[PDB]
Amino acid sequence: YDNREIVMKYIHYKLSQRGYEWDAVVHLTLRQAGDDFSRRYRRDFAEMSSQLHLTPFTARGLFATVVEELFRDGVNWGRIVAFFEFGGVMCVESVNREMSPLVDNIALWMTEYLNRHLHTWIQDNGGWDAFVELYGPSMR
Amino acid sequence: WLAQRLGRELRRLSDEFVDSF
Ligand code: NI
Ligand code: NI
Ligand code: NI
């Protein structure tokens, strides 16, 4: 699969859910998984969003530190869903705070992390098709 | 330290979530 396309379509959906139109089965499964995750952890996401205080000064370090901590001792599909939802949080905060150019940066950072850090794990664990299979019983 | 805290909580939640599949 093309990880950049996965990132771009995911972010476009997170932003469209906030009323923002960003000029950029796997997609739909990831879409529902991320929504289920942030609905399940609504209070936690609300607290994260209120402490982000996102600025162009802090965005790169925020992203790198959260993601490094998230995968500190390894990878699983839940942590990958969390990675996408956290990227979505940063993008929504970007447009909310009239910092919409940061969305382009965040999408680049997410694509670079998926391609150059998570790729070997995704490949060794059956690829995105394995994720579709695992989450399939939770769809609809 | 905000980002370190966010990442740790996201990790915990993630591991709970994947157990729910
Ligand atoms: Ni659109
Ligand atoms: Ni890298
Ligand atoms: Ni819990």
Give residue B13 CA to ligand 3 midpoint distance, Å.
6
Cα distance between residue A14 and residue A36, in whole Å: 13
Question: Is residue B21 helix, strand or coil?
Answer: coil
Cα distance between residue A20 and residue A43, in whole Å: 23
Cβ atoms of A44 and B9 closer than 8 Å: yes
Q: How near does any CA of chain B get to the CA of A24, in Å?
A: 26
A136 contact partners, CB below 8 Å, separation of at least 6: A29
A62 contact partners, CB below 8 Å, separation of at least 6: A52, A54, A90, B2, B3
A and B: number of Cβ contacts within 8 A: 70
Query: Domains in chain A, start-ordered, CATH in brackets?
Result: 3-138 (1.10.437.10)
The closest CB to that of B17, out of A67, A81, A86, belongs to: A81
DSSP assignment of chain A: --HHHHHHHHHHHHHHTTT------HHHHHHHHHHHHHHHTHHHHHHHHHHH---TTTHHHHHHHHHHHHTTT---HHHHHHHHHHHHHHHHHHHHTT-THHHHHHHHHHHHHIIIIIHHHHHHTTHHHHHHHHHGGG--
Interface of A with B in 23-52 (CB under 8 A): 37, 40-41, 44, 48, 51-52
